[model samples]
Target: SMTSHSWLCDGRLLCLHDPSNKNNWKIFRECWKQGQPVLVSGVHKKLKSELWKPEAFSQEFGDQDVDLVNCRNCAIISDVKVRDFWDGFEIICKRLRSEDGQPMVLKLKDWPPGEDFRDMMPTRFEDLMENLPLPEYTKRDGRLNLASRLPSYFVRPDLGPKMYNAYGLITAEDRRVGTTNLHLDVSDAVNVMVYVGIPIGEGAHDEEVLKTIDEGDADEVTKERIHDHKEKPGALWHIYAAKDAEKIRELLRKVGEEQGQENPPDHDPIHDQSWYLDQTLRKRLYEEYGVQGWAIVQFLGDAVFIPAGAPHQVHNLYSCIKVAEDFVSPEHVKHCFRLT
Candidate 1:
């Protein structure tokens, strides 16, 4: 039911960037707010061309102190994207000395923020993003911005004091279990991440992926998307995007009542067909409201943009090296700003 013009498709995946005018820039951001997921292909330069490459990552922070950090795990997705970092983690408070020597830093830190949460970036991260015409917004924060967020670090320099960032991992295994479940950038920023799969097998090379970046990004089924989408964890690598919570709730009440039973078996955010909805929801969404959702396969050298305030879920075919960050634009401040 979701057509190119539907609100659900407002944030559909597209390979667009660096608009000609600010009005066009606003149009892009508005679609972003409407839940449009951007997919800009053929990005070149240092960051896109290489950083996600395994050798480069190891050269940068492979030796960082995993001392304070623990092994993180993905038991739910044990085969698809299982990580062994912090199956068990805890936060504790500690004491430290201040700049001069004053006993300060009641800064209690347990699972130390090491290379994983390190806000800094490798040299060329901004090479590809520098020219894109990103929507601008006034700096609302009064404090200093360390400029930690990668998206803003180079792009939105004026708002240096206020930026956000993040990290994620994907193993080399290609099983559905190796896939990453869902997590919206609660940080409320324009979320951007690159998938650089460290090929464990099947010649998971860089060029192979970059070429097929936009391959399976549509409703029309093809040879590549042979997996039965009627079931959970469908598609080789499925990317599902939806509007923000408020809009989703409004849409739900609007259409759900018409279909009878707003409550499914569990009080799932979107009900039926396992933890993530697919066939049934798609039919209802189209049949009742004339709108569905969005999808895209995360091929190589591709930067998937999970628009600020949108709800999204990603599944990778194999364990890939992924890097991502989040930053809030002026028009979409309310969602990220009010995030608890």
Candidate 2:
């Protein structure tokens, strides 16, 4: 998840006020028209309870089984009890390694087994969903979301209100892979970051450990890198517009050829989850292909709205808990149709 020598974003995300306000709504509309993600802060404060915290979740549902995916290879190794995973999470961040001496990173996705969060835990779901930022723009019945008017036969195109939990730990060998692989959805979505737990005392030592574990020159490690670990606790995001989809595909194919993947996937290359645009790859994408995307950092209590058909990926900089809800926005309905 580490990029270049700087752990924080090189640029800031477009920030907007609450979309319910008429003025802010107009601003949001303009940003959306250009296919850019906007950040709306102070969302978490609306929550009546801090139940989004991992500690609360562990205490309530710790004994349940949760699937774990190895971040380096993006493979689901196994399922473990939530209690055990959280209990050992600190140690895992500091010391876990694979048999061949690779740093192993595991993240929890598609949680609560097979059931929807609303069905599995109706009470808490109500609490969180009710507090979602820009409810009129994000809720299923919200006026701006076109999904509310779909015919009954179409079912619901929205896929989630799912949670993602991951640690901030990064190792030298694991610096180039994404926590959430680059992929696009057929509908628009809003991800609300509820919590970002800053590293305290030796908890901030992962960057130190990262340097010690590096096989290359540690001289490249800078004070800012260590400073970011403790000061900025969030996720780094790279989101490409729907229009650049083909260009991204072409560039990825060129890279694939170089790597001996002569026959690219029969489907979309972005759907294959084979690449993460770290600094070097990003530089090449712009220099050679004239393709540029948004690079933003999502801080605690911020809601990030991603338009439909945009290719995006996330890299966690610290322990973060976020919930995402998909929708159908009129502006991106064309994208939804094409992607579908």
Candidate 3:
């Protein structure tokens, strides 16, 4: 039954080239099947190109607690998965003199990532969606817009009763601007990220970078490591929602069983599995226990469609800023119900 057409055999992330493809059920089914994160470009009118710029953000939210993201090696990114749900290494706090000759000998307490940047600034940015300079994108096809489905597609009176609403409707920027630890959304959602920061391009090769970081070879670090960050690229979306339920329970169950039974003493995510680990211990898995998944290199204005139950994480390629929203649909209601 799991493998039925209901499973959506053609499930995979796709890039939309043309506009009419919005009605193409194949692309839509990919989202329904919870297979991977699909990305659609050219949907934004003038949001990405004209309005949402890092310089614009600086004007609105001036240095009042900006979030910093740590980009990692690609090979480790593709291969890494967590064993411990909540370990201390998820985030760190260091005060690097911003090249302008200021000094600090203080430490951030409880060291929240985006919560409290005592030294930094920037609480929120103006809602550009509501107040973007008029004369936005001219040709508008409402169907191609991902948010169009939020109103009606989720109404399922059959799935054990009652009308359903989307799980959340919050734009993730400001502190939510930093990278995300790998985990699953409990339900389905769509994230439309408009980069308002400097775009850090691709880094050196995976193996090459890994050697520098893993070995702590200060000499090797400069060779290929430090140079990559100099370019200052955007985030790399690494996703791992491979295999159907049966396949994973069959193949990965034993591996999943390999994990220790104790829930981490540290604060874990809402619904992270043993495999949904963070970046610290994840390094071991990258080299020793690899996984198979996909990665999306996104730019300003691109919206990513994360199907139900996709396991994914983000590597902030630079000091990036973005806004995102999560959605729930009829296709995702049952799984959402079961999990909750």
Candidate 4:
């Protein structure tokens, strides 16, 4: 998302995807490097404080993390607390360190009590933007877009008779950007990962890579060349595919079994979808799965994956990579084509 300042208000939460002021990566980088905190002042100040605190920060965040971090409304003011600067720093550090090895799962704690607790619970899109503070530059149309935008039904608690939420993080610097594209949750889903790096590289570069695929001559060597171009100082490319998914599931299952999880061994079916949620999961999945469909492919020392509908923009983090899954449903394949 883009960041900007307002004269009428000390702080405002503006989405970068908004049209008015296209988020400028250069500006964002400069601001972040300078350690300019995005203050959710006014009623949001308290919520921002509590959510941003070091103790609560997780290397990975799931749906619950998203709720706690992005809570809104008047209670935010009362709930404010100044978070330690180290919390943000540690988040970036852990992500960077994981680039050389397997992706780790960052854990989180449950939300505390009070109105903030109520706000932490999932709510409708209409309610999410009910009392949100918008910047002066935010157009009426832009405001409408923000209000109308709803979390996918998979992540929406009110959508059905049953609801489930999964937690994950984009912890590694390599898996931070251009990894996953837009996707709807078949079930409730929430993801939270702090963006500690700056946006680099033009979306055109990614377009070029996509175009190369159409040429049909593209292979691992070509993919490697593309990776070299995308890698930044601390960034790396990360790829995820079916095999990676199996490995991750296997690991989870193994751990569950070791811990005596309630689910039966055969009952633990890995989902058809997969992506490098973070550097942590990406590495572990790769080590465990042994690479399939170029799943967990690394370029310029980063992990990259392609997800169904989730198109992502490239950034300048030196260690950054993309993670996502292929479009076809593995279960539907009728031919000799390999799954994962």
Instruction: Highest TM-score: give the candidate number.
Output: 2
User: Candidate 2: worst 10 consecutive residues by lDDT?
Assistant: 2-11
Model 4 C-alpha lDDT per residue in residues 1-340, reported as the tens digit of each score: 4435321112211112221233433333343233221211122221232333234433322213222121111011222222322233234433212344632222211232222423343442222223223222111234312212333321212221111111122323323433222122221111112122222222123443343232222245434545566432222222223223345556656655666667666643334222223334445545766642222122321212123222122222222211111112122122113232
True lDDT of residue 218, candidate 3: 23
Q: Per-prediction RMSD in angstroms?
A: 13.3, 6.3, 13.7, 16.8
Question: Candidate 2: what lDDT?
Answer: 0.67
- Candidate 3 lowest-lDDT run of ten: 160-169
Which segments of model 1 are wrong by more than 4 Å?
Answer: 1-13, 17-27, 46-50, 64-73, 76-178, 186-195, 198-217, 220-291, 337-340
- Which pairs clash in model 2? none
TM-score, candidate number 1: 0.48
lDDT per model vs. reference: 0.36, 0.67, 0.36, 0.28
- Residue 168 in model 4: lDDT: 24
* Model 2 deviation from the true structure expressed as Cα RMSD, one decimal place: 6.3
Kindly list the per-residue Cα lDDT of model 1 for residues 171-215, writing each as its tens digit: 222122213333344333332334332323323333433323234
Residue 281 accuracy (lDDT) in model 2: 78
User: What shift in Å separates residue 35 of candidate 4 from its native position after superposition?
Assistant: 39
Better by TM-score, candidate 3 or 1: 1
TM-score of each: 0.48, 0.82, 0.46, 0.26
